[PDB]
Structure formats: structure tokens, C-alpha cells
Design a protein around this ligand. Structure first.
Ligand SMILES: C=C[C@@H]1C[C@]1(NC(=O)[C@@H]1C[C@@H]2CN1C(=O)[C@H](C(C)(C)C)NC(=O)O[C@@H]1C[C@H]1CCCCCc1nc3ccc(OC)cc3nc1O2)C(=O)NS(=O)(=O)C1CC1
Ligand SMILES: [Zn+2]
Length: 191
């Protein structure tokens, strides 16, 4: 099993929400084996890939977070070498590494706003309302297809702070009504 390789970012740089591929299939395959990745990394939200899976990962106060169901127990490739997991919790579906060289980090939310925004692998910013600790209702029903591959991605409050990490979609008859996420509180207890 190779290392997770950062293959793009979801950009909230300026006044538009958009994804950028920064590596291709073959070169990803090459980098996973060794774990040595020179590539220019930027930003808070990374697109990350394994041999079979592509998903998201979000840096929040110096730690890159994602889902175990995506990342398994794998290292993540870095300029120096494979980077071992800092945090690992299979029940929470959570893994964390040190935040990558080049990254920015989001700040945990302190607002307690319930208006939230899920950022997807397609670079859509989808509005969500807080349902409670770890659930949030989409204002606009989507098929599961649409959200698939956006695990590891942030739910942001209106200040652009992180509320949590997208974990799963609450679906009936193929339609996501709500989403499940790992709250920052739970990260900050995991830390
Ligand atoms: C729509 C996008 C959605 C974010 C995505 N997540 C999933 O697909 C998860 C993974 C798996 C099933 N998922 C679901 O979302 C299901 C599904 C019907 C399939 C939508 N929904 C669901 O259970 O609803 C129940 C209320 C919630 C209860 C919570 C479920 C538990 C979460 C979960 N935890 C663990 C911990 C450890 C494991 O060890 C290997 C494995 C796990 N697997 C898990 O669920 C995603 O995009 N992934 S991804 O990016 O495509 C892939 C590359 C990584
Ligand atoms: Zn906030």
C-alpha cells in the first residue's frame, strides 16, 4: 500500500470557488510508492488520491484532516518523505496528518452559527443548516452521485471557519437530504 498523494486543491483563494488539478494519474502512481512529493502544494482544502480513491482533506490549525474510509492507515507523501498519521480513529472515520508544506489552515468555528456551507470535490459551495451536533440539512436535495468524492471536505460557517469534516450523506432513495460530518469539537477532543 502506497502513500496518499495530493493531486489538487479546492480553491477559495479569491471571489470564486474552483478546483485545480496539480498532478496527473501516472505521476500520482509514481509518488505514492516513494512518498516523496516535490509538487507545489497550496491552500486549505486538498484533493487527495490513493490507488483507487479520490477524495478531500482539510487543514485546520496545523493538521490535515480527512476520512479513514478514504485514507485508511496510509502515510501522505511530502517533500521530505512519507508522513505518518498524527491522529487515527476508525470509529470516528477520522485521520489526521501534520498540515502540508505550502498549505494554509482554516480556523475552527467559534461563532455557533447554524448556517453552514459544504465545499465539494466539484468545487461547489453547497448551503447547509445545522441540525445538531453532527448532522446538517441541505437546502437543496442532491443525488448521492453529486457528493460522492467530497469526504474530507469542510463545512464552513459564514466567517469561513471550519465547523467540521464531511463524513457521510444521509440518503433515501438515492437522494441526500442531509449530511454527516465530524465536528471541530471532536477533532479538538481527538487532539
Ligand atoms: C455522498 C458522499 C459521502 C461522503 C462520502 N462518504 C461515504 O460514502 C460514506 C463511507 C461509508 C458510506 N458512506 C455514506 O455516506 C453512506 C452512503 C449510503 C454510502 C452514502 N451513508 C450513510 O452511511 O449514512 C448514514 C447516516 C450515516 C452514518 C455514518 C456512516 C458511517 C461513515 C463511515 N465511517 C466509516 C469509518 C471507517 C471505515 O473503515 C473503512 C468505513 C466507514 N464508512 C463509513 O461510511 C464520500 O464521498 N466518500 S468518498 O469520497 O466517495 C470515498 C473516497 C473516500
Ligand atoms: Zn463560525
Amino acid at each position: 500500500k502506497g502513500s496518499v498523494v495530493i493531486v489538487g486543491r479546492i480553491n477559495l483563494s479569491g471571489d470564486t470557488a474552483y478546483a485545480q488539478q496539480t498532478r496527473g494519474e501516472e505521476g500520482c502512481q509514481e509518488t505514492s510508492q516513494t512518498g516523496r512529493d516535490k509538487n507545489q502544494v497550496e491552500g486549505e482544502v486538498q484533493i487527495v488520491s490513493t490507488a483507487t480513491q479520490t477524495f478531500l482533506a482539510t487543514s485546520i490549525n496545523g493538521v490535515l484532516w480527512t476520512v479513514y474510509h478514504g485514507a485508511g492507515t496510509r502515510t501522505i507523501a511530502s517533500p521530505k518523505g512519507p508522513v505518518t498519521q498524527m491522529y487515527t480513529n476508525v470509529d470516528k472515520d477520522l485521520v489526521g496528518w501534520q498540515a502540508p508544506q505550502g498549505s494554509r489552515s482554516l480556523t475552527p468555528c467559534t461563532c455557533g452559527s447554524s448556517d453552514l456551507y459544504l465545499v465539494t470535490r466539484h468545487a461547489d459551495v453547497i448551503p447547509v443548516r445545522r441540525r445538531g451536533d453532527s448532522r446538517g440539512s441541505l437546502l437543496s436535495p442532491r443525488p448521492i452521485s453529486y457528493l460522492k468524492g467530497s469526504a474530507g471536505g469542510p463545512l464552513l460557517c459564514p466567517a469561513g471557519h471550519a465547523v467540521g469534516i464531511f463524513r457521510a450523506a444521509v440518503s433515501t432513495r438515492g437522494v441526500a437530504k442531509a449530511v454527516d460530518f465530524i465536528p471541530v469539537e471532536s477533532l479538538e477532543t481527538t487532539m
